[PDB]
Each structure stands twice: as structure tokens, then as C-alpha cells.
Design an enzyme around this catalytic site. Structure first.
Site, short mmCIF file in Angstrom:
data_model
loop_
_atom_site.label_atom_id
_atom_site.label_comp_id
_atom_site.label_asym_id
_atom_site.label_seq_id
_atom_site.Cartn_x
_atom_site.Cartn_y
_atom_site.Cartn_z
N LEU A 261 -2.54 -57.21 -3.56
CA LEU A 261 -3.05 -58.12 -4.59
C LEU A 261 -4.15 -59.05 -4.05
N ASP A 262 -5.01 -59.52 -4.95
CA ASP A 262 -6.11 -60.43 -4.62
C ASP A 262 -5.63 -61.85 -4.28
CB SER A 263 -7.47 -64.63 -2.58
N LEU A 264 -6.37 -64.73 -5.63
CA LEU A 264 -6.01 -65.49 -6.83
C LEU A 264 -4.92 -64.81 -7.67
N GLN B 167 -2.32 -62.80 -6.52
CA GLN B 167 -1.00 -62.84 -5.87
C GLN B 167 -0.25 -64.15 -6.12
#
Ligand SMILES: NC(=O)c1ccc[n+]([C@@H]2O[C@H](COP(=O)([O-])OP(=O)(O)OC[C@H]3O[C@@H](n4cnc5c(N)ncnc54)[C@H](OP(=O)(O)O)[C@@H]3O)[C@@H](O)[C@H]2O)c1
Ligand code: SF4
Ligand code: SF4
Ligand code: SF4
Lengths: 88, 206, 147, 176, 296, 106, 111, 75
Positions: free
Chosen positions: H35-38, H40
Site C-alpha cells: 500500500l501507498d504512504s497515504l 496504508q
């Protein structure tokens, strides 16, 4: 007749509504204190209503002291309205 | 000269005293460049301290300005530092007009003039609107002259006069007013610039 | 046959008699729109009434310049209007952006927001020329609903 | 210069207090204010009904554009692009080609009424006095297409107003 | 019984032909010309407004709550037209046992017309302004009852027919000098839009302007009279209409000449200032028939 | 008698004398080598001599103000705030900040 | 250092995280209070595609300015502001929309 | 705490853009799940509303695994 006179006005008033309806085809509690004082004053008016129709047979000296008495207390109720009524 | 000259210089030497007086304090923090021409004074200020310059001229025994009224900003892409926020100040007791300028590129935040001047906050919103310069420690930074669904900053010389989002149709959708359409009528770019230099002394050597 | 043709003109005469316009103060044009009230050049109670109101009015005059901020604002006024509605684009800004035009904020044409029936070309639209806009509107109403 | 708006206590004692109280007890000044409109009702109103009467004007007035011509035929417009560059709205467009043989006077000549803020600048910038602003009010269309002026033609059709223009320009040479 | 229709149809025409008076007389006050294009002097415009709004103009309701919104104009027009029945005139239609009590009752129920309109809209945005409009009418009805009684206690019972007979030589404006000033102001509170202002929407105009004529006539009974003459009905009919028309001019006078008093300071003119004044005159009017013999 | 501004015209003498004597001490706390102290002091001392010589005269108020004592008191009231801000943030005493890029002509 | 902006490198990343939560909570709220328009799920997909274009991160100076702008154009809904389904709408409704190909764009002939 | 892992796993598996069986217990949302930084951290915000506790910005950075999230949930 009073019944015939009253009903004729309302039946013609209802007919005017249908003309526009059928033919074409394509918060703040400070207001409450004013409303209450209306009711309480009008009841004092209700007690002071008979005056022109009542004073015909009764003694004037017995009435004079009592007739003004209601209006005095009606001003005392307004005197309590001067000791901070609000922003209204 | 009778009709050729507007006014003879007489108060120019009197206004030049201000060009010395503020410079007699001599801060590298404040002063830098002092320019005086046509009965007017111009000062540019180092980005690090703008508020201490604005507290000065306000009150003060020698000169009383108080009103830091009108507030402009200059967009110029020639210099390495882009924007130039220009303060126009007026005195009521003294009757004089002085100018306060900023030299920084100010894509990075600049100090606000709200604690010194009350009406300055409304002008500070316009600079963030048209130019896109953020003011640090600012109360209520809201859009005024720009649209609510507007992208970028409407004044910058980098983009055209027409813009990107400008035309608003209605057509097919019953209620939604259109936005993504970009085409407009042709603004004729005039190339009218006269050969030969206009005025002497203004010429700078390459 | 003859009564059908004559009764249609009688309904059209009702709009020929009186037209209530919307008082939009969105222009320098709006000051010339206030000259319609000024006694020297009057359509006041000749047809025009300055009571306006968003719902009761039959005509709406789009006075001059419109921005992208006012583009959703003027559209919802048009929806509140009754079915017999006529829109006058008084002023060069209302016709297609007299000035500005190529600008980012000003909406070109007004017809991109609200459809126009009568166009008035004048910047300072002289009250003499403004008198045509209402008189032409009254003349344009000729025939409505044949069948 | 100072003029002072404040009255600084109009009432002092007895006589000056009672009349200031009388206007607040009953009305008086409202009845005096009633009399202002009363006399205003009787005096004749200055009203002009447009389809019969006409309002005041001037010898120099700018309305709908129309280009003039010489008394012995010939289009007065010489094609310069002079009026094109002065135009603050950029309503006027001009593209010029040689007329048959010898003469060189216009081909494309469109003035937008969607634009044009009415200056008389094009009247002033013109050395030959081609565009002269005539006393015009009547212009109302169904579309933008009908409103914006075509390649001369409708501008040349200003002959119906050119008789007035010739009279108005006689009050224009050596200005007023 | 045909006379009822001879007191609705010419009355509905009187409310219609008000549109001429309400902007031509108001017009000359503002130095503007009113109706002129439509008729010879604009006489065709009042009937032209009826064809515009009734037949062709369609409806777009906010929510339409079953019975309401299509019931409020019936209460508006019905109560305004029924007020004409107890009116004394030269001769009244079906004269009530007590006159003025019927007059005050149907006016106090006419408050509902602006109440049900506030309940018709689903939004909170409209009802706050609607209740404020109720406050303009409800407050002045307190004093309206008091100033009525002071005139009655001077002479006559509640019957409106007796009020004409008592004014034989002199008008009631002279004995009731401060009380006559009150009736010029107190009547304007009932949606006249002069001291304070807030299809079926067009029907409210036909009801609100009807009350304006009603208050003009009712002031011309309590304070005006001049002569009675039972033998000659011709002399009374002409003289009554001129007196009522002069009061109609004064109603349109306040609408043009004077700005709005603010809602808060409307409760400073009345209640704070008028209610102590009206009751003090009511105190005075109790003593008057006792000090000197004045009993009907 | 009252002034046109919101500030109340109060009959108070020596009130101007207290505030003008207070600001002189604040200037002699941190800056000494700076020209800000050296120039402002001689204007204030020139003004203090006019107050001592003229007893409650309108001519004393007319000197470098001419809008009564109420306007002159406002000039002294914000003087203490201006001196304290100049003492807190170093600008007059120290000069070492970087110079701007070489461009000025339009 | 110069210039300050608001945060230094790593602190600027967590300011975006705080901004992401505030805007994620408003998209279900701006259906009943505002209008239905499209969908609640489709509105949340509009959020993710917006941050993908902004995803670069080379200097905190660029990141900090995006936070202030992000607390303005996405703030045009929280404190209740007039738009009437015309302003604050990011997605094109009438877009053609054009594609990037040497067969699709060349057939239409552009530039 | 007893009966805390069952309440968090039911909400996490039901949510969109997540594997129902491949990622469960101890595995990180940003490292193991994908998943991405934002994206997740956004899944952790939805779980906070269901449990009935507000999570600060400082504690949100450290938490990634559901096993680690169960310990942080206790107050
Ligand atoms: N949802 C559906 O109902 C549905 C379902 C399946 C397919 N369709 C198809 O989609 C189309 C829908 O169109 P619609 O029903 O929305 O159109 P419509 O509302 O009936 O509009 C047609 C217009 O054309 C004019 N017109 C047509 N024939 C005319 C004639 N002979 N003489 C004079 N005027 C004439 C009418 O004007 P006047 O009124 O002035 O005469 C009318 O305003 C239909 O053609 C149908 O085949 C519709
Ligand atoms: S057309 Fe002229 S007068 Fe009218 S709004 Fe535009 S600039 Fe103003
Ligand atoms: S109108 Fe006059 S200035 Fe313009 S092109 Fe013609 S001759 Fe030249
Ligand atoms: S009047 Fe002004 S705007 Fe119009 S065509 Fe002439 S120069 Fe252009």
C-alpha cells in the site's frame, strides 16, 4: 342570515385558488418573551372590555376605584418590563 | 519652460534629508537601497525583518506616519528573485508619502503586516490570490477576487490572459455549470515596440 | 375560428401592458438601469415596476459584467423565474464582454449561463436606447400556443 | 477648513427643552416632512414617453458605428490598421487587399458589438474621417451573429444615418 | 339575498384599481409618471395584471405539505372580505348584535394568513423572517383594542350603527385629539409596508391591499361623520367616499415619504413608549363619562 | 470641551512629562553605539523644554502637533511600545544581514 | 535555516497525512449536506488520483506550499461555502477526452 | 486485552483494496500488504471509528501491523 353571509365569502375564496392550480398545462428564544406578554396584556384588556357596555345600571363610585385599578396594575406589569427586558 | 515642466525641484533636497536620517541608523537588517525621485521616496527592505521596519514610521518623534494604507505587489521575471511586494504609506500629521519594498523571491513565506496594521490583512489575501505569496502568522487567509474553483494564480506572467479554466457552458447537464472547456477568441498580440532608445541616461551598459 | 385567434392576442396584451424586471446591481449599466426610474426617461408604470422580487418578476435584466463567481449565482435566479420569462442583456459586457472578454474571470456572451432574447449594444446604454429594449420585447410577443 | 456637523446641545432650559420634546412626544417634523412631498405632488413631472417624445442630446454623440464616404462616390476608408491598434477592446479587425487596379482600399472590415466599449477613439485616430459616430439608439437582435457587424456592408448601410452625420460633422470641424 | 355579491365583486375591483392609485399618486410624490401606455390614463393595466398572474403564471412549490399553502390564501382573502359585512355604511348588510367586536375578531384571526405561509416553506431560512412579520401585527393589536374602547366609552355601545348617530354636529377627532394620531400609525402595522416591512402569491396582494381600504373606512366611522340624514341616502353616499379617499392618500404618503423604523425600535415606539401613552388616555377616558354625563 | 477623536480629552498635565522621561531610560538599556538612540533623544529633549516653559497654554500644544494634548498623548503612548520592540529585535545596533542581488533598473 | 516555510523535510510528510484525514471525512458529509452528484465511493477515488500528480517530494519548500493550498481548495466545503455543484468540482464532465497515441491523435490532426 | 484481535480483523478484511486471506496477523500494511504512504494509514483511520477511540498523528506513524495496532488500541 349570518351563516349564509359567512359561507359565501369562503366558497368564493376557495374558487380563486383552483384557477391558478388547475387551468394551465404544458432558534432565537428572545421572540418568545414578546409573544407571552401579548397574551397576558390581552387578558387584562378582556377584563377592561365591558366598560362602555357595563357602566349603565351599576353605581359609578363603586366602579371608579375598581375600573382604574386594573389599568394601574397593567402599568406595573410594564414597569417590570423596564428592569432589563433585553436587546429586543 | 512654461508648459513643458510640471514642477521645479525645491522640496527634493528637503525630502533627501529622510534619505539620510533613516540611513544614519544604518542597518544591514533594514536599509539596503534608498531611491528618491520626483518628490517621492522609495526604500527596499531585506526579507528577514519587515515587521521592525513597519513598527518604525509608526508613531516616532521625528516623523509620524501611522497610516500604512495601500498595499501593492510587482510581478517581474527578469531578476533571479521574482516578486516585489510594495507598501504605500501616508502621513496625516506630517503630510508625506514614503514607500516600503521587498526584494525576496517570496515563493517561500514572508512575514505578515497584520499586527502593525489592521486593514493590511485584506490586502495580504490579494497577494496570495493574484501572485501566490504566503504570509507567515496570518489570521484568516481567504480567497477574495479569485474563483472558488480556480487553479493557480491569475496574475502571474508565466501563463496566458485567457487562462486554462474560463469558459462556462450549461448545455447537456440540467444544473451543473461547465468548467473544463478552455477555448476562447483570439487576442491579437501587438508587436508595437519603437526602434531607437526612448530616453538618455536610462541606458545601461552591457 | 375567429375567437381562437383574437383571444391569443389578449393574453399577449397582458404582457404588452406590464413587465416586471429584476434589479441586478452588477454593473455601471445598473446606474443607467436606475435612469429608467429617473423621470426624464420613464417606462415606470408604463410597463416597468421597480419592485422586482426573485419569484414574482417576469423579466430579468442581466446588467453588464458577469464573473465566474456570479455564474452559478445568476443561474439559480433564472430557475426561480416563472415560465413566461424574457432575458435582456443590457450593455456591451452582457452581449459578449464589451471590455475584458479575453480576461480569465469574465464570462463571455452570458448565453453560456442564461439564454438571451433581446440584446442592447450600448456601453453607457443611454436611457433613450434602453427604452427600445422594453418596446421591442412588447413587439416581439406576437403568437403563443396555436394548438 | 472645518464646518462642524455636531449641534452641541440645542436645548438648555425651559423654552428650548419643550419644543425639542414636543417633536418627540407627538410628531410635528413628520407632518412637516409630509408637506415636502405634498407640494412635490402638485408640480408638473418631467417625463418623456419614448415612442412619441424624444429625450435631449448633443451634436457629438457616440452610438452604433457607421463608415462614411466621399460626396462623389468612393469609400472614404483608406485601410491603415490605425483604428485597429488604438481600439482598447480590439473590436475592429482589418485585412486589406488592392482594389482591382491602382486603388488600395479594404477587404475585411469587422467591428464587434459583443466587444466595443464606445470611445470615439477610432473616430479620433482616423485621418480621413471614415468612422464617424452617428446618433444611434435602435439596435436589438436575437443572436450574437446578427449583432456583430460584417465586412462593411451593414456599416455602409449607415447611409440612412449619414445625412445626420454630415450635419453633425459641420459642428465638429474646429471643435465646438 | 343578492347584495353580498354586490359587496365582493365591486370590492375586488377596488383592490384591482388600487394599482393605478398606488403608483400614480405615489408617482407624483416621486415626480415620476405612473400608468400611461396601457390605457388612456392607464385604466386598462389593473385588469391586465389579473390576466397575467391568474391564468398563465404556473406554480413551483417548495414542498407543498398536503393541505397547507393551498389553504393560506383562503384564510387571507376570506377574512379580508368578511370584514365588509359588519360595516355600518348608509345601511349595513346583516347588522350584528355588537359591531366592533366582530371587527377586532376577524382582524386578530387575519394574523394566521402570514403564519401558515411561514409553515408552507420547509426551510428554516424563511420562518425566522415570517415570525418577525407576525410580531409586527400581534403587538399593535394590543393597543388597537385599547384605543377602540376609549372612543366607545365616550359615546355609544359596540354597535357600528350608533357611532354614526353620535356624530351629528362635530367630529370625534376634536375630543380624541391624541387618539386620532394613534390610528394613523397603528393601522399601518398590518402589512402596509410603511413603518416596517417583512398564483397564490398574487392572491396575497388582493388580500393585503383589501385591509388598507378597510382601515381607511373604519377610521372614517370612529372619527369622521359630518352628517347622517336618514331621509336622503344620496347625500351620505357621496360624502362618505371623499372622506375615505383622503385617508387612502395618507396611507400612501407614509409609504413614500418615510424610511423603515427598524424591527427592534418598532418595539421601542410601541410597548416602551406608546403603551404608557395609550393607557394614560384610557385612564382619562374612564373618568370622562363620570365627570360629565355621557352614557348611551 | 472634547476632542473629535474617540480618545477622551482629559485635563491632565505632567502626564506627557512622565511618558517622555520613561522612554529615555529604555533607549539607554541595550543600544548605545547605534544611531537610533543618538537621534531620537535630542528631539524628545527639545519637546520636554517646551512643556516646562509653557504652563497649560494652547501654544505648547500647537508646537509639532496642533491637535490639542490628546493627540500628543497618543504619540507618547505608542512610543514606549516602539522602543521596547526596537530593544527586543536587534536591527539598529547590529548590521550583518546579506545584500540583495544586483538588479534595480526597470 | 532559510527559508522556514513550516516544516523540515520529514515533518512536512506528516502534515500531508493530517490533511488527508480531514478531507477523507468530508466526502461522506458533502453528499447529504451538499448534493448526491456522483457517488461516495467515486468521490474517495478522486482523492487518490489528486495526490498521485502531486507526488514528487524533492524539497520541503514545495511540500509546505501544497499544504496551505490543500487547506484552502479542500477547505471550500468544511466551513460551508457556496458552490452549487459548479465550484470545487475537479473532474471533467464534458471532457472528450483526448488520448496519447500516434494513431488516435494523428487521425484527428492536432498541432 | 481479550477479544481485541477479532474486532480489528473483521473491519480490515471487509475494506476495499485489501487481500482477504493473504495478509493476516503480524504482517505490515506498508511493507507486506502493498500500500501507498497515504493509502496504508487511511485504513487505520477507519478502524478507529469502529472501535470508538481517537488516534493522534504521532502514534499513527509507528503503527502498521494489526498485532501492533491491538496493543495501541488499549487505554
Ligand atoms: N422515454 C421514452 O419515452 C422513449 C422510449 C423509447 C424510445 N423513445 C424515442 O425517443 C424519442 C423521444 O422524443 P420525445 O417524445 O421526448 O419528443 P417530444 O417531447 O414529443 O418533442 C417533439 C417536438 O417536436 C415537435 N413535433 C413533432 N412532430 C410534429 C408534427 N408532426 N407537427 C408539428 N410539430 C411536431 C413537437 O412540437 P409541438 O408540441 O409544438 O407540436 C414537439 O415539441 C421518440 O421519438 C421515441 O422514438 C422514447
Ligand atoms: S457595458 Fe460599459 S457600462 Fe455596462 S457594465 Fe460593461 S463597462 Fe460598465
Ligand atoms: S477607419 Fe480610418 S483609420 Fe481605420 S483603416 Fe479606415 S481610414 Fe484607416
Ligand atoms: S469606439 Fe472604442 S472600442 Fe469601439 S471600435 Fe472605436 S476604438 Fe474600438
Amino acid at each position: 342570515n349570518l351563516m349564509l353571509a359567512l359561507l359565501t365569502n369562503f366558497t368564493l375564496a376557495t374558487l380563486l385558488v383552483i384557477i391558478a392550480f388547475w387551468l394551465p398545462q404544458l432558534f432565537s428564544m428572545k421572540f418568545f418573551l414578546v409573544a407571552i406578554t401579548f397574551l397576558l396584556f390581552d387578558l387584562e384588556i378582556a377584563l377592561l372590555l365591558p366598560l362602555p357596555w357595563a357602566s349603565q345600571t351599576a353605581n359609578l363610585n363603586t366602579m371608579l376605584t375598581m375600573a382604574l385599578f386594573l389599568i394601574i396594575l397593567l402599568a406595573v406589569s410594564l414597569a417590570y418590563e423596564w428592569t432589563q427586558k433585553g436587546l429586543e | 519652460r512654461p508648459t513643458v515642466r510640471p514642477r521645479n525641484d525645491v522640496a527634493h533636497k528637503q525630502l533627501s534629508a529622510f534619505g539620510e536620517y533613516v540611513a544614519e541608523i544604518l542597518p544591514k537588517y533594514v536599509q539596503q537601497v534608498q531611491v528618491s525621485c520626483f518628490n517621492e521616496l522609495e526604500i527596499c527592505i531585506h526579507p528577514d525583518g519587515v515587521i521592525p521596519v513597519l513598527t518604525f514610521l509608526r508613531d516616532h518623534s521625528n516623523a509620524q506616519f501611522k497610516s500604512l494604507a495601500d498595499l501593492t505587489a510587482v510581478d517581474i521575471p527578469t531578476r533571479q528573485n521574482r516578486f516585489e511586494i510594495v507598501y504605500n504609506l501616508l502621513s496625516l500629521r506630517f503630510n508625506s508619502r514614503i514607500r516600503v519594498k521587498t526584494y525576496t523571491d517570496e515563493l517561500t513565506p514572508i512575514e505578515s503586516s497584520v499586527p502593525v496594521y489592521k486593514a493590511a490583512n485584506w490586502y495580504e489575501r490579494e497577494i496570495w490570490d493574484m501572485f501566490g505569496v504566503f504570509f507567515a502568522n496570518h489570521p484568516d487567509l481567504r480567497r477574495i477576487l479569485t474563483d472558488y474553483g480556480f487553479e493557480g494564480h491569475p496574475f502571474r506572467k508565466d501563463f496566458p490572459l485567457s487562462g486554462y479554466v474560463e469558459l462556462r457552458y450549461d448545455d447537456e447537464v440540467k444544473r451543473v455549470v461547465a468548467e473544463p472547456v478552455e477555448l476562447a477568441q483570439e487576442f491579437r498580440k501587438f508587436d508595437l515596440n519603437s526602434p531607437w532608445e526612448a530616453f538618455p541616461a536610462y541606458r545601461q551598459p552591457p | 375560428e375567429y375567437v381562437v385567434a383574437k383571444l391569443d392576442d389578449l393574453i399577449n396584451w397582458a404582457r404588452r401592458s406590464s413587465l416586471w424586471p429584476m434589479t441586478f446591481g452588477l454593473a455601471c449599466c445598473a446606474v443607467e438601469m436606475m435612469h429608467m426610474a429617473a423621470p426624464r426617461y420613464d417606462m415606470d408604470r408604463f410597463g416597468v415596476v421597480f419592485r422586482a422580487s426573485p419569484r414574482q418578476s417576469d423579466v430579468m435584466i442581466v446588467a453588464g459584467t458577469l464573473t465566474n463567481k456570479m455564474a452559478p449565482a445568476l443561474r439559480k435566479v433564472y430557475d426561480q423565474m416563472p415560465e413566461p420569462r424574457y432575458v435582456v442583456s443590457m450593455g456591451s459586457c452582457a452581449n459578449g464582454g464589451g471590455y475584458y472578454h479575453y480576461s480569465y474571470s469574465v464570462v463571455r456572451g452570458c448565453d453560456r449561463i442564461v439564454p438571451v432574447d433581446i440584446y442592447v449594444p450600448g456601453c453607457p446604454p443611454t436611457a433613450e436606447a434602453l427604452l427600445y429594449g422594453i418596446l421591442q420585447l412588447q413587439k416581439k410577443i406576437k403568437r403563443e400556443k396555436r394548438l | 477648513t472645518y464646518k462642524y456637523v455636531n449641534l452641541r446641545e440645542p436645548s438648555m432650559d425651559m423654552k428650548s427643552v419643550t419644543d425639542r420634546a414636543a417633536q418627540t412626544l407627538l410628531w410635528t417634523e413628520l407632518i412637516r416632512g409630509l408637506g415636502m412631498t405634498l407640494s412635490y405632488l402638485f408640480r408638473e413631472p418631467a417625463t418623456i414617453n419614448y415612442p412619441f417624445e424624444k429625450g435631449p442630446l448633443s451634436p457629438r454623440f457616440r452610438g452604433e458605428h457607421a463608415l462614411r464616404r466621399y460626396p462623389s462616390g468612393e469609400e472614404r476608408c483608406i485601410a491603415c490598421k490605425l483604428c485597429e491598434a488604438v481600439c482598447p477592446a480590439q473590436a475592429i479587425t482589418i485585412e486589406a487587399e488592392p482594389r482591382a487596379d491602382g486603388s488600395r482600399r479594404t477587404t475585411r472590415y469587422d467591428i464587434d458589438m459583443t466587444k466595443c466599449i464606445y470611445c470615439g477613439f477610432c473616430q479620433e485616430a482616423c485621418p480621413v474621417d471614415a468612422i464617424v459616430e452617428g446618433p444611434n439608439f435602435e439596435f436589438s437582435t436575437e443572436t450574437h451573429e446578427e449583432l456583430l457587424y460584417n465586412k462593411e456592408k451593414l456599416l455602409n448601410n449607415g447611409d440612412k444615418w449619414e445625412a445626420e452625420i454630415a450635419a453633425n460633422i459641420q459642428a465638429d470641424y474646429l471643435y465646438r | 339575498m343578492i347584495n353580498i355579491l354586490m359587496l365582493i365583486i365591486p370590492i375586488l375591483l377596488a383592490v384591482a384599481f388600487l394599482t393605478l392609485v398606488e403608483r400614480k399618486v405615489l408617482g407624483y410624490m416621486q415626480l415620476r409618471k405612473g400608468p400611461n401606455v396601457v390605457g388612456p390614463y392607464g385604466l386598462l393595466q389593473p385588469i391586465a395584471d389579473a390576466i397575467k398572474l391568474f391564468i398563465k403564471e404556473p406554480l413551483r412549490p417548495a414542498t407543498s405539505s398536503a393541505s397547507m399553502f393551498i389553504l393560506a390564501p383562503i384564510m387571507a382573502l376570506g377574512l379580508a372580505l368578511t370584514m365588509w359585512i359588519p360595516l355600518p355604511m348608509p345601511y349595513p348588510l346583516i347588522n350584528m348584535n355588537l359591531g366592533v367586536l366582530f371587527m377586532l375578531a376577524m382582524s386578530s384571526l387575519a394574523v394566521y394568513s402570514i403564519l401558515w405561509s411561514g409553515w408552507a416553506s420547509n426551510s428554516k431560512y424563511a420562518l425566522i423572517g415570517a415570525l418577525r412579520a407576525v410580531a409586527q401585527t400581534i403587538s399593535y393589536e394590543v393597543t388597537l383594542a385599547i384605543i377602540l374602547l376609549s372612543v366607545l366609552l365616550m359615546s355609544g355601545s359596540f354597535t357600528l350603527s350608533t357611532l354614526i348617530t353620535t356624530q351629528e354636529q362635530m367630529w370625534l377627532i376634536l375630543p380624541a385629539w391624541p387618539l386620532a394620531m394613534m390610528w394613523f400609525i397603528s393601522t399601518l402595522a398590518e402589512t402596509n409596508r410603511a413603518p416596517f416591512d417583512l398564483g397564490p402569491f398574487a392572491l396575497f396582494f388582493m388580500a393585503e391591499y383589501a385591509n388598507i381600504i378597510m382601515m381607511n373606512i373604519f377610521t372614517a366611522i370612529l372619527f369622521l361623520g359630518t352628517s347622517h340624514n336618514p331621509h336622503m341616502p344620496e347625500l351620505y353616499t357621496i360624502n362618505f367616499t371623499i372622506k375615505s379617499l383622503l385617508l387612502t392618500m395618507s396611507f400612501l404618503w407614509i409609504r413614500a415619504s418615510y424610511p423603515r423604523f427598524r424591527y427592534d425600535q418598532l418595539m421601542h415606539l410601541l410597548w416602551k413608549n406608546f403603551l404608557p401613552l395609550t393607557l394614560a388616555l384610557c385612564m382619562w377616558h374612564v373618568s370622562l363619562p363620570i365627570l360629565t354625563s355621557g352614557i348611551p | 470641551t472634547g476632542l473629535v477623536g474617540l480618545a477622551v480629552c482629559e485635563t491632565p498635565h505632567e502626564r506627557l512629562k512622565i511618558l517622555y522621561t520613561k522612554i529615555l531610560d529604555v533607549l539607554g538599556h541595550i543600544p548605545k553605539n547605534a544611531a537610533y538612540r543618538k537621534y531620537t533623544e535630542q528631539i524628545t529633549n527639545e519637546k520636554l523644554s517646551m512643556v516646562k516653559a509653557e504652563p497649560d497654554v494652547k501654544k505648547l500644544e500647537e508646537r509639532l502637533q496642533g491637535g490639542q494634548i490628546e493627540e500628543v498623548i497618543l504619540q507618547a503612548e505608542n512610543e514606549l511600545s516602539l522602543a521596547r520592540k526596537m530593544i527586543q529585535w536587534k536591527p539598529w545596533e547590529p548590521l550583518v544581514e546579506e545584500p540583495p542581488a544586483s538588479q534595480w533598473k526597470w | 535555516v532559510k527559508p522556514i516555510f513550516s516544516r523540515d523535510m520529514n515533518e512536512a510528510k506528516r502534515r500531508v497525512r493530517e490533511l488527508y484525514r480531514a478531507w477523507y471525512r468530508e466526502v461522506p458529509n458533502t453528499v447529504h449536506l451538499f448534493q448526491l452528484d456522483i457517488s461516495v465511493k467515486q468521490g474517495r477515488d478522486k482523492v487518490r488520483e489528486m495526490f498521485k500528480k502531486n507526488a514528487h517530494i524533492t524539497d520541503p519548500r514545495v511540500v509546505d506550499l501544497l499544504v496551505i493550498k490543500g487547506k484552502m481548495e479542500l477547505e471550500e466545503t468544511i466551513k460551508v461555502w457556496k458552490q452549487r455543484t459548479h465550484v470545487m468540482r475537479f473532474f471533467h464532465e464534458t471532457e472528450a477526452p483526448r488520448p496519447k497515441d500516434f494513431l488516435s491523435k494523428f487521425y484527428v490532426g492536432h498541432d | 486485552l481479550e477479544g481485541i484481535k477479532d474486532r480489528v480483523l473483521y473491519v480490515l478484511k471487509l475494506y476495499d483494496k485489501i487481500d482477504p486471506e493473504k495478509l493476516s496477523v503480524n504482517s505490515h500494511f506498508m511493507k507486506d500488504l502493498g500500500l501507498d504512504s497515504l493509502d496504508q494509514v487511511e485504513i487505520i483511520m477507519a478502524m478507529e471509528d469502529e472501535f470508538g477511540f481517537e488516534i493522534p498523528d504521532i502514534d499513527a506513524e509507528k503503527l502498521m501491523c494489526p498485532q501492533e495496532i491491538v496493543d495501541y488500541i488499549a487505554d
